[PDB]
Design a protein around this ligand. Sequence first.
Ligand code: NI
Length: 124
Amino acid sequence: KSCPNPGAIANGQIDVPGGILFGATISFSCNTGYKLAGSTSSFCLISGSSVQWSDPLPECREIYCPAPPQIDNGIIQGERDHYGYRQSVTYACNKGFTMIGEHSIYCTVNNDAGEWSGPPPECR
Ligand code: NI
C-alpha cells in the first residue's frame, strides 16, 4: 500500500506533493550547476506482488565549463582539471607586462551548459 522511502539524489531534490502511497507521484530536479540524467518523476505502482516506484531516481551531474583560455605573456594561477558553476580562474601577467581587462572570469551556466562569464584579460 506504500512505496519505500524515495532515498536521495546527490546534488538534486525530490519533491513529494502527496505522500508515497500506492498511486502517488514524486518529481525530481537538480541543484543549480547540475544536469539531470534519467527520470524526471516516479509513480508508486504495483508490479507482481511488489508495491514499488515505476522509475529509479535520476542522477545530477556537474555542469563543466570548457578549459579556460590561456593568454599571451600571462598565466593562470593554478588551473583546475574541471571548472564548475561559480568557480573562477584568475590571471596574472608576466614581468614587464601590464594587465588590461578582467582579472578573474567565472564559470556560469547558459542553458544547461558551462559558459565562461567573459573574455580573459590582455597583457601588454
Ligand atoms: Ni578542452
